[PDB]
Every structure is written in structure tokens, then in C-alpha cells.
RNA sequence: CGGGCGCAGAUCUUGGUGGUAGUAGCAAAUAUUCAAACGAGAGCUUUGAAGGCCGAAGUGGAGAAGGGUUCCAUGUGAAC
């Protein structure tokens, strides 16, 4: 509902949305930037390899403290991790977008991820217990995810 | 053929060398499972419970130095799993390990 | 404690019957004005005194 | 399923600890239908629930010493 | 004509949001492992087997004070 970057041709495009998803926003934004411009089948093979840690997700922006890996050189980057949580939620949304292209009547084998963004959702409220009788906020960072897939 | 069964001698002593006392027996089964994947080129290794008793026979830290093991590659026959085959790993009680070669068994 | 007075047990009986959530048909009555029972207490996080 | 009610009911029927209650792994679906002490007693009479024997604490060495 | 009439500051008030930061951290009391079951989903549930610990000044079995339904069965798996 009210996507950003409305498609160039809405007839050859399928959309998928997700709100209040309990993935980490920083881990998901880096995962979403990895699958952008990939085919629907290449994005699935890439995300399925991140879960089994066969290729990494390069952490470009939120890279403070993340470690280095040998798989990061594939992306001309030094830092990379394997956000299994972010790979599964994005894999569940690619499955929904592929099923939306079927209901619309699109060639699913020709889909390419045109637009994909991850917003910040309202943070969830939990608390941790610190020293000297203090309570600090233990806040979740959920995310809104949307994506546009087009034919090529 | 596809369905095959051989007997191996896993030198567990050199695979758990340098492991803490509380992890020598759990690491041995992870090395036995890795051994079955390496030799029998099939994931989804199923370790017989009698073999779990054999590795844990002398506690968590005193693992037997070697283990006579029979690797039986079978078909899953369910088609619910992606792996068509699986390696059923059993225990072979032997009196001595001297001269035990890798041999195939009959069906 | 197992040893209770009749006044304490009668007091705990009232609080035990108020710790019930609102009926579902209440939200259809007041136009979703009362969304939940804001007086729900848990036996750990809030004591009775 | 979760055989926690049957593990508890059998320990009170057999008058043993929960560490001595043996539930048949092959008949886990049959024991799961037992929701009362009377049905547990029937499973014991059928041999599906047995009291495991006490771990041996032989006094042979001390009696030898 | 009448004002509770103009803010950047007051370790201002209230509310909201950042960088730090996917960071510190989730390191006291020896221990888990195999298989199976249910299940969309299992290192963590259950069952069995194995190997361990508490070792009767128990990590055991029952009370007092205090708690007040936390007891028990079933269901759910949003939130915690
Ligand atoms: Mg305090
Ligand atoms: Mg308290
Ligand atoms: Mg003023
Ligand atoms: Mg101001
Ligand atoms: Mg009740």
C-alpha cells in the first residue's frame, strides 16, 4: 500500500510488502542491498547460500564491529556476515512476490528485483536490568520491507 | 553401484587431538559424521545408537583411540527430504585393530 | 499462606474475579472505546499489599 | 507427543521416582491417550509402562575389605 | 480594544529521535550425546539409550511466614 518508486510498467511488475517484521533493520538493510538487480532465482540461490554460509552479505553502512571473511572479496568489500534471520525473511518475501507474479500472469523466470527497501518499524519495548538498581531499555529494531519485481 | 556398504577404521585419536575433556566424546561423533560425509559422498549421516554407546563407552574424555565402523549408504525412499541417499553408520565390535583394512561387505 | 483469615480470603476472592479480561461483545457495544482491561494484574509483577 | 503427564502419573502409580518410570518408545501414541491413573494402571498391566530396577550398589568390595 | 503575545541556551520542563552501535554484552556452581516421536518449523520439547552432576548440613522429600491461583487439564504460540 503506497509503495515508493512506483513501477515503470505496472502490468509487467509484481509487488510484495511486509510490516513490523522482527528482523534486525541493520542486518536486513545490508541483506536487501545485496539482492538488488538480481533475478528472482539468483536472489533465492544467494539467500539460501547465506543461510548455509556459502557466500556472505557485505556490510557496507552498518559495518561497525562486524568481522572480515574470505567471502567478502566476492563483493569487493572487507566486512561481511551471514544474517540468517535477514535471509529468511527476505526469502519469504521473494516467495510471496513470485506468487504474486503468478496470480498476475507474469513470467516468473524473467523477474528481476527492481526496487527493494527496508524501513524502520516502531521499536518494541523490553527492558534489561543493570547495576546499582537501574533499568535500561532493551529495544527491538523491527523493519518494514517492500520490493518491486519486474520482467526483463 | 549406488547402494554400497564398507567397513572403515576411524582413527578417532588423531581427530580429537587437542580437544578439552568435556568435548572429546561429542567431537568424536562430529568427526565420525564428517568421516561418513567425506568417504561416502552423501550428507544426512545417521549414527547408530550402539555406536553412540561405543564412543561414550569410557566417559566424555576417554574416547577409544580407534573405532571399527561400517558405512552403509542407503536410499531415503521417502522423497520428503532433498537428499536421495543417506549413510547409516553402525558399530563393529572387533578384538584387535591391527591389520584391519577397508573392506566391502555383502548384501 | 495456607493460614488465611476470612476477610483476607474474601478479599483475594474479589481480586481473583476482577482479573478476567473484558467480554468480546463489550468492544461492539461502546464502539471499541474500551479495548482491553487496563486493571489486569499479574501475581508476580504487581502485588496486592 | 509430550509424555509429561504420563511420566508423572506412572511415578505415583508405581510408587517410584520419575527416573524409574519406563515408557515404551514404540507405543508413544498409545501412552499419550492415557490421561488418568486408571489408564496408566492398564498400560502397566500390558507391559507398556514398567518400573526400571534400582541401579546396583553392590556392597561386595566393602564386605571383602 | 484586551493580553498567559514572539526563545537556542536557564546541568530549563515534557515528549520524541540520533551518533556511539549490530558495539559493550548474553563467561560464577564439571556435561552433554545418539536415535525416535509430535510438528510448517527442533542444539533447547517429549520418549528411550548412553555418559555425568547434586551425594542425605542434597540441586531430595515436607512445612512456617510471605505470595494469592502462581495448583491441575486443555488450547494458543501474538506479546512476555
Ligand atoms: Mg536491587
Ligand atoms: Mg516478587
Ligand atoms: Mg509567556
Ligand atoms: Mg527549543
Ligand atoms: Mg481458573
Instruction: Please give the distance of CA A23 from its chain centroid, rounded to a whole number.
Output: 9
Grid coordinates standing for C49?
Answer: 499489599
The SS3 call for residue B70 is strand
The DSSP 8-state label assigned to residue B31 in this structure reads H
Measuring alpha carbon to C1', the residue closest to nucleotide E69 is: C16
C16 alpha carbon, closest ligand: 5
* C1’ E13 / CA A136, Å: 22
Structural element, H or E, at residue D45: helix D37-45
Q: Are strands B4-10 and B45-47 parallel, antiparallel or unpaired?
A: unpaired
Q: For residues B3 and B73, give the distance between their C-alpha atoms in angstroms, rounded to a whole number.
A: 5
Place of cell 510498467: A9
Asked if A142 contacts A124 with a C-beta cutoff of 8 angstroms, the reply is yes
Spell out which residues of A between 83 and 142 contact strand E, using CB within 7 Å. 120, 123-124, 126, 140-141
Resolution to 1 decimal, in Å? 2.4
Structural element, H or E, at residue D23: strand D21-23
Strand E contacted by A78 CB (< 7 A): no
Helix axes D37-45, D4-13, angle to 10 degrees: 80
Structure determined by: cryo-EM
Place of cell 557466500: A55
Q: For residues B65 and D3, give the distance between their C-alpha atoms in angstroms, rounded to a whole number.
A: 39
Strand E contacted by C7 CB (< 7 A): no
DSSP per-residue letters across A93-152:
HHHHHHHHHHHHT--GGGEEEEEEEEEEPPPB--EEEETTTEEEE--B--EEEEEEEEE-
Burial class of residue A149 in the structure, from the number of CB atoms within 10 Å of its CB (0-12 exposed, 13-18 middle, 19+ buried): buried
Asked if A69 contacts A81 with a C-beta cutoff of 8 angstroms, the reply is yes
Burial class of residue B37 in the structure, from the number of CB atoms within 10 Å of its CB (0-12 exposed, 13-18 middle, 19+ buried): middle
Any alpha helices (H) in chain C, and if so which ranges?
Answer: 6-18, 24-29
Q: For residues A10 and A16, give the distance between their C-alpha atoms in angstroms, rounded to a whole number.
A: 13
Ligand 2 centroid to residue A124 C-alpha, Å: 25
Q: For residues C34 and C37, give the distance between their C-alpha atoms in angstroms, rounded to a whole number.
A: 8
Opening angle at CA B67, ends B65 and B72, nearest 5: 155
C48 alpha carbon, closest ligand: 2
Instruction: Name A106's Cβ contacts closer than 8 Å, sequence gap at least 6.
Output: A12, A13, A14, A151
* C1’ E33 / CA B26, Å: 6
DSSP per-residue letters across A30-76:
HHHHHSSS-BHHHHHHHHHHHHTTSS-EE-SSS-SSPPB-GGGGGGT
Grid coordinates standing for B59?
Answer: 566417559
* C1’ E13 / CA A30, Å: 40
Q: Strand E nucleotides below 7 A of a protein CB?
A: 17-18, 20-24, 30-38, 45-52, 63-70, 72-74, 79-80
Amino acid at each position: 500500500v503506497r509503495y515508493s518508486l512506483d513501477p515503470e510498467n505496472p502490468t509487467k511488475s509484481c509487488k510484495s510488502r511486509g510490516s513490523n517484521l522482527r528482523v534486525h533493520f541493520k542486518n536486513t538493510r545490508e541483506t536487501a542491498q545485496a539482492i538488488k538487480g538480481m533475478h528472482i532465482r539468483k536472489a533465492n540461490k544467494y539467500l539460501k547460500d547465506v543461510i548455509v554460509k556459502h557466500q556472505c552479505v557485505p556490510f557496507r553502512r552498518y559495518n561497525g564491529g562486524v568481522g572480515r571473511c574470505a567471502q567478502a572479496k566476492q563483493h569487493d568489500w572487507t566486512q561481511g556476515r551471514w544474517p540468517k534471520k535477514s535471509a529468511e525473511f527476505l526469502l519469504h518475501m521473494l516467495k510471496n512476490a513470485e506468487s504474486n507474479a503468478e496470480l498476475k500472469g507474469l513470467d516468473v523466470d524473467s523477474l528481476v528485483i527492481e526496487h527493494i527497501q527496508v524501513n524502520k518499524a516502531p521499536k518494541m519495548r523490553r527492558r534489561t536490568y543493570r547495576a546499582h538498581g537501574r533499568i535500561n531499555p532493551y529495544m527491538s529494531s523491527p523493519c518494514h520491507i517492500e520490493m518491486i519485481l519486474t520482467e526483463k | 553401484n549406488e547402494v554400497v556398504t564398507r567397513e572403515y577404521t576411524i582413527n578417532i585419536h588423531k581427530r580429537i587431538h587437542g580437544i578439552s575433556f568435556k568435548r572429546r566424546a561429542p567431537r568424536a561423533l562430529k568427526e565420525i559424521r564428517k568421516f561418513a560425509v567425506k568417504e561416502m559422498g552423501t550428507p544426512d549421516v545417521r549414527i547408530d545408537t550402539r555406536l553412540n554407546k561405543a564412543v561414550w563407552a569410557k566417559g566424555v574424555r576417554n574416547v577409544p583411540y580407534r573405532m571399527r565402523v561400517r558405512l552403509s549408504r542407503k536410499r531415503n525412499e521417502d522423497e520428503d527430504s532433498p537428499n536421495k541417499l543417506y549413510t547409516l553408520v553402525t558399530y563393529v565390535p572387533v578384538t584387535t585393530y591391527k591389520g584391519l583394512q577397508t573392506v566391502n561387505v555383502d548384501e | 499462606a495456607s493460614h488465611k483469615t476470612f476477610r483476607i480470603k474474601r478479599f483475594l476472592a474479589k481480586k481473583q474475579k476482577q482479573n478476567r479480561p473484558i467480554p468480546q461483545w463489550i468492544r461492539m457495544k461502546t464502539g471499541n472505546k474500551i479495548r482491553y482491561n487496563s486493571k489486569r494484574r499479574h501475581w508476580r509483577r504487581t502485588k496486592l499489599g | 507427543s509430550m509424555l509429561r503427564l504420563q511420566k508423572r502419573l506412572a511415578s505415583s502409580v508405581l510408587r517410584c521416582g520419575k527416573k524409574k518410570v519406563w515408557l515404551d518408545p514404540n507405543e508413544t501414541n498409545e501412552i499419550a491417550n492415557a490421561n488418568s491413573r486408571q489408564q496408566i494402571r492398564k498400560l502397566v498391566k500390558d507391559g507398556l509402562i514398567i518400573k526400571k530396577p534400582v541401579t546396583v550398589h553392590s556392597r561386595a568390595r566393602c564386605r571383602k575389605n
